[PDB]
């Protein structure tokens, strides 16, 4: 499976078009109370996240619950549907915009993609030793509201780097994005506080993330990193002070240490 690693991910920022494909939340449920009072779940709209780490481009394919109607083994179906939708997107693009590499968030996507991309034999499909939680996008109201409200499947295009590439590298933007996503992933409440340093902190309507000065981003990034390491340390009973620089890099990236 896992070719992408914390020691070769510099590759991500070169000339080949690369997509991460996350199928984690294609078939999706929410917790709800039955009015009768009891706790249980109900299926809600899902999404495929398809992400280019150099450009910041996000293809968001909303999956309406109607696809599940009358089907068994929804976990399996979700994987096969994701592969079908990724293949469809590739075919819809001119050859010069088609990816050369697909990196799957989950190994379960390896085989379905191989089968659907049988007519694109030179596309490399690989797993990742990292664990980049694109699912944390669901905790961003913009995305959470859009997916939940959908009445039909649809593709919506976004960019997860906002205007950052005007002043910082893809690597630096990726590193910022991963800090944001992993922080949201592990502690939604604390991350959103960190991402709102001033009462005047706002996000532009055409953006995903707050408008912050260069200096404000530095502080945010320190605080997010601090949150991720403390959370990890608590979960794994490891003292943060004991961590090496390399271990810290691995933790942020979601890699096993
Ligand atoms: Cl760059
Ligand atoms: Na992984
Ligand atoms: Na700026």
Swiss-Prot record:
Effect of residue 29 to D: Strongly reduced interaction with RNA
Tissues expressing the protein: Widely expressed.
Protein localization: Nucleus; Nucleus speckle
Region RNase H homology domain, residue ranges: 8-257
Region of interest called Involved in interaction with pre-mRNA 5' splice site, as start-end residue ranges on this chain: 1-257
Summary of the function given for this chain in its UniProt record: Plays a role in pre-mRNA splicing as core component of precatalytic, catalytic and postcatalytic spliceosomal complexes, both of the predominant U2-type spliceosome and the minor U12-type spliceosome. Functions as a scaffold that mediates the ordered assembly of spliceosomal proteins and snRNAs. Required for the assembly of the U4/U6-U5 tri-snRNP complex, a building block of the spliceosome. Functions as a scaffold that positions spliceosomal U2, U5 and U6 snRNAs at splice sites on pre-mRNA substrates, so that splicing can occur. Interacts with both the 5' and the 3' splice site.
Disease: Retinitis pigmentosa 13: A retinal dystrophy belonging to the group of pigmentary retinopathies. Retinitis pigmentosa is characterized by retinal pigment deposits visible on fundus examination and primary loss of rod photoreceptor cells followed by secondary loss of cone photoreceptors. Patients typically have night vision blindness and loss of midperipheral visual field. As their condition progresses, they lose their far peripheral visual field and eventually central vision as well.
Quaternary structure, from the entry: Part of the U5 snRNP complex. Component of the U4/U6-U5 tri-snRNP complex composed of the U4, U6 and U5 snRNAs and at least PRPF3, PRPF4, PRPF6, PRPF8, PRPF31, SNRNP200, TXNL4A, SNRNP40, DDX23, CD2BP2, PPIH, SNU13, EFTUD2, SART1 and USP39. Component of the U5.U4atac/U6atac snRNP complexes in U12-dependent spliceosomes. Within the minor spliceosome, which acts on U12-type introns, interacts with PPIL2 and RBM48. Core component of U2-type precatalytic, catalytic and postcatalytic spliceosomal complexes. Found in a mRNA splicing-dependent exon junction complex (EJC) with SRRM1.
Name the UniProt record assigns to this protein: Pre-mRNA-processing-splicing factor 8
UniProt source species: Homo sapiens
Portion of the full sequence shown: 1760 to 2016 of 2335
């Amino acid at each position: 499976e896992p070719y992408l690693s914390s020691q070769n991910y510099g590759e991500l920022f070169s000339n080949q078009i690369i997509w991460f494909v996350d199928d984690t939340n294609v078939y999706r449920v929410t917790i709800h109370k039955t009015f009768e009072g009891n706790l249980t779940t109900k299926p809600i709209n899902g999404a495929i996240f398809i992400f280019n780490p150099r450009t910041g481009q996000l293809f968001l394919k909303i999956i309406h619950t109607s696809v599940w109607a009358g089907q068994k083994r929804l976990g399996q179906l979700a994987k096969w549907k994701t592969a079908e939708e990724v293949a469809a997107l590739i075919r819809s693009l001119p050859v010069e915009e088609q990816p050369k590499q697909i990196i799957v968030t989950r190994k379960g996507m390896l085989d379905p993609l191989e089968v659907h991309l049988l007519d694109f034999p030179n596309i490399v499909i690989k797993g990742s030793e990292l664990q980049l939680p694109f699912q944390a996008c669901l905790k961003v109201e913009k995305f959470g509201d859009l997916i939940l409200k959908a009445t039909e499947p649809q593709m919506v295009l976004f960019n997860l780097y906002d205007d950052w590439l005007k002043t910082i590298s893809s690597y630096t933007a990726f590193s910022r994005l991963i800090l944001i996503l992993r922080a949201l992933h592990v502690n939604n409440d604390r991350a959103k506080v960190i991402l709102k340093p001033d009462k005047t902190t706002i996000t532009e309507p055409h953006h995903i993330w707050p408008t912050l000065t260069d200096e404000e981003w530095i502080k945010v990034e320190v605080q997010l990193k601090d949150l991720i390491l403390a959370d990890y340390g608590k979960k794994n009973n490891v003292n943060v002070a004991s961590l090496t620089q390399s271990e810290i890099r691995d933790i942020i990236l979601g890699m096993e240490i």
